[PDB]
């Protein structure tokens, strides 16, 4: 259009809810398991 | 080379003209149209030799 | 298996992402929570255990039921939150509290709670002043509530006050149970 | 000069004499930039209230 402010949306499913592809859980999972948090103390294994 | 068939001709025996078309453009330029012409002298057979 | 009990259907989710592939699911979308509710007419009578034990979110395998059936304790109580809707271990709560009200305010005085139990919600007294409570706002007085005293409940014994009053259900008594489930099949197979 | 800014391939041994003609006509390669958003490594999610 020519403002901007009149962009908006149609109905919109929010990225709340969406929903994973699976490999992207295993990035976002990771970054919030492996960082911020504990930077392993972990007894399994390095694999 | 895409898009060929080989058709033989009774009453000119001795030919059997092959129809060849480029994956790229139209007509088959030369030195290629040479080269599709080698390659058929190692095996051809015969008389009976390619156009 | 007494959830489940039919099929995966399938879960299109068209709506989303045009020609998404359809992935079996579990068929979560009957309305289960009303054929047992028909189903149970005329076994009611289901009495009060009182639970007693912050047992954990299963007790289905101790008292009436016990093929670890973790539920028909829940269409008891119209559970809208497995989670939370049974009580909990009592620091549970607690715990439950500060994450509650960590983000603002820290830890607070809800209502002072009169006896005969008449609550109140941001009244305030003044110590070293008048005996006689105020609200939080209006600070020039003028305006006071409850001439009374009465004692407040502060934040952690209201959770633990709030879901302590959790803790009454329905059984079905552990008789019924066989012969109620024997009806409970017998509407689901009767719809389709 | 020593730059080898570009390589490009005949189909078949061009052998004689060759033509490149440029298929958008007349321009050779053209770009477009993109803009790679930070990505925000983040679910603590907290909420006023």
Known sequence: PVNYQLTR???????????????????????????????LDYDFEGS | IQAVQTF??????????????????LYLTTVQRE????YLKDYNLAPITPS | MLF???????????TVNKNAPTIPMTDIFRN???????????????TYYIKGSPRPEELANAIYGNPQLYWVLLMCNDNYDPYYGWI??????????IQKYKNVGGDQIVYHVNENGEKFYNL?????????????????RKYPQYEGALAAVDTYEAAVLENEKLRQIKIIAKSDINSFMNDLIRIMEKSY | ????????????????????????????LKAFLQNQEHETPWSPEEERG
């Open chain 2, 35 to 38: 080269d599709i012409k080698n």
């Open chain 2, 8 to 25: 033989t001709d009774s009453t000119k025996p001795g030919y059997a003209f092959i129809a060849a078309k480029p994956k790229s453009g």
């Open chain 3, 88 to 97: 909990t271990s009592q620091e549970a709560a607690y715990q439950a509290s």
């Open chain 3, 124 to 140: 305030i007294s003044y110590d070293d002043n008048p005996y006689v409570w105020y609200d939080k706002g209006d600070k020039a």
């Open chain 3, 32 to 46: 289960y929570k009303d054929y047992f509710k028909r189903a149970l007419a005329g076994y009611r009578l289901r």
């Open chain 3, 4 to 14: 489940t009990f039919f099929d995966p259907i399938e879960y299109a989710a068209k």
């Open chain 4, 1 to 28: 000069s020593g730059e080898i800014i570009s390589y490009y391939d005949f189909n078949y041994r061009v052998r004689d004499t060759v033509e490149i003609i440029w298929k958008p006509t007349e321009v050779f």
């Open chain 1, 9 to 39: 949306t149609a109905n919109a499913i929010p990225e709340i809810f969406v929903g994973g592809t699976f490999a992207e859980i295993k990035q976002n999972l990771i970054e919030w398991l492996n960082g911020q948090n504990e930077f």
